[PDB]
């Protein structure tokens, strides 16, 4: 575990993370995809060997010894708000199980279902709260990666408010 488990947020490409493992915002088919998924495919393409997994689950594949946790959030274009909310919460619970199983002291994590899978809605709070629900009982240092400067502000505020 980390000596004083923390949450942090950085505004940069998760493919340049400084953590012991990465969570991919994966598609269910293990395809190179778009956005975070494409960046992860370019950095760790070996991790896409048999990475296909259903919505609401996480599947870890090693790139060398570096674990890539493929977490499949729901596409809110296809799911109802209710069912999508359930699957988004479930994907993060599976990430917490994997992070725990791997014994890492740190994990880089994007906000699931906030990009192309958001169904064109702002899901920062919904996705971040499900991340906290899952990860709060883990003792890994969690570093959240985002690209938008105002998202960085809002995530940093949400972290600092519970401190
Ligand atoms: Cl960057
Ligand atoms: Cl997404
Ligand atoms: Cl963002």
Experimental method: X-ray
- Residue 3 tokens, joined: 């000596």
Start-to-end CA distance of the chain, whole Å, equals: 19
Beta partners for 68? 22, 61
62 in Cβ contact with 48 (< 8 Å): no
**Ligand positioned closest to the Cα atom of 17:** 1
* Residue 116 marked as a ligand binder: yes
Q: What are the φ/ψ torsions at residue 78 (nearest 5 degrees)?
A: -105, -35
Residues, beta carbon < 5 Å, ion ligand 1: 12-13
CA 69 → CA 17, 33, 52, 76, 120, distances in Å?
14, 15, 11, 21, 25
Would you call 61 helix, strand, or coil by DSSP?
Answer: strand
The Å distance, Cα 152 to ligand 2 centre, comes to: 16
Helices (H), the chain: 36-43, 81-102, 124-135, 149-161
Ligand nearest the Cα atom of residue 77: 2
Rounded Cα distance between 150 and 148, Å, is 6
From the number of C-beta atoms within 10 Å of its C-beta (0-12, 13-18, 19+), residue 142 rates as buried
Give helix 81-102 / helix 124-135 axis angle, nearest 10°: 40
Sheet with 66-71, strands from edge to edge, namely 7-11, 141-146, 106-110, 22-25, 66-71, 58-63
Ligand closest to 84 (CA) is 2
60-63 long-range contacts, CB within 8 A, separation 24+: 60/21, 60/98, 60/101, 60/102
Structure-token match 């505004």, residue found: 11
State the Cα–Cα distance between residues 158 and 162, nearest whole angstrom: 7
The reply, when asked if residue 17 is annotated as ligand binding, is: no
């Amino acid at each position: 575990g980390a000596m004083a488990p923390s949450y942090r947020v950085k505004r940069m490409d998760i493919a340049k993370n400084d953590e012991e493992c990465v969570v991919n915002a994966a598609n269910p088919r293990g395809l190179p995809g778009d956005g975070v998924c494409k960046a992860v495919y370019k950095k760790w393409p070996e991790s896409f060997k048999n990475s296909a997994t259903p919505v609401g689950t996480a599947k870890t594949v090693m790139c060398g010894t570096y674990p890539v946790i493929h977490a499949v959030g729901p596409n809110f274009s296809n799911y109802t708000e209710s069912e999508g909310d359930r699957e988004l919460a479930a994907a993060y619970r599976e990430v917490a199980k994997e992070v725990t199983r791997l014994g890492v002291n740190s994990v880089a994590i994007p906000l699931l279902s906030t990009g192309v899978y958001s169904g064109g809605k702002d899901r920062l709070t919904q996705s971040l709260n499900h991340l906290f629900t899952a990860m709060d009982s883990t003792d890994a240092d969690v570093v959240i990666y985002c690209r938008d400067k105002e998202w960085e502000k809002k995530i940093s505020e949400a972290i600092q408010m519970r401190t």
